[PDB]
Amino acid sequence: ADPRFAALETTAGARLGVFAVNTGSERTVAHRADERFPMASTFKGLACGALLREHPLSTGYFDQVIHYSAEELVDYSPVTETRVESGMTVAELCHAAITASDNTAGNQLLKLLGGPQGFTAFLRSLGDDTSRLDRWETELNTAIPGDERDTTTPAALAADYRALVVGDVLGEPERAQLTAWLVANTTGDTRIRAGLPEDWTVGDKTGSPAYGSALDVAVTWPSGRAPIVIAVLSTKSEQDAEPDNRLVADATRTVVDVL
């Protein structure tokens, strides 16, 4: 393994999990890639993918309006709080869940999927027998060390995003829309995006649960080359620790250098 990852995590006082795959050559880079970390808001992109697979755009399903109540609003609901009166279409909830990380939007997608259990069943349907979602927003962010609830691994998370964005799990309109939402993410500018060459196209989904956790998963296209899928998950030993965005960016640049 490349010694940069051990130095990165030791200096940052964090446990660092990395998995990246060049989908053209199949070369990989892995550090703690099979260890569990919180999945947290990285579930939101997968939940959109699950709904897109269960209800293709051509059915009209994404045009229906969900009339969620004000009582269902949880902490950090930047879009959904502004639309309680009118409701939001499923497509708008997906946009909010991915690009703004809206927590009520995430719960609304979970409801349509049959809750955390139905979402986890979708992960199994991708061949992911490791990741699991157990709770709703915002309890799923507790990130207690050792607790397997609401966890993934760098390798499993990368595989799932690869299958939905690069691979052929979804139909073509659904794959394109999921890709567009990830590329339009607004929450990731200091994480994986900050470690990549400026010219690469990037779509990503972040999360920042407790225990100083900084998570990001991305698909990136170097100019005219096959995409690279990158998962970088980090967490710390103290509940109230500070997430380290620059750790995610630095691990990403290390991946670029190795691949």
Q: Per the residue annotation, which of 41, 208, 213, 234 is the catalytic one?
A: 41
Based on the residue annotation, tell me whether 26 is a catalytic residue of this protein.
no
- Alpha-helical (H) ranges within 63-211 are 90-95, 103-113, 115-125, 154-161, 172-183
Query: Contact 156/130 with Cβ under 8 angstroms?
Result: yes
Residue 139's domain is classified under what CATH number?
3.40.710.10
Please tell me whether residue 231 adopts helix, strand or coil conformation: strand
Among 121, 74, 125, CA closest to 101? 74
Tokens 């997608």, residue located: 109
Q: Per the residue annotation, which of 9, 92, 137, 174 is the catalytic one?
A: 137
Among 138, 6, 113, CA closest to 53? 113
Based on the residue annotation, tell me whether 137 is a catalytic residue of this protein.
yes
Residue 252 neighbours by CB distance under 10 Å: 24
Structural domain of residue 194, as residue ranges?
4-258
Among 1, 93, 47, 16, CA closest to 249? 16
Instruction: Enter the DSSP assignment of 132.
Output: B
Domain count, the chain: 1
Give dist(CA 188, CA 207) in Å, integer: 9
Residue 124 neighbours by CB distance under 10 Å: 12
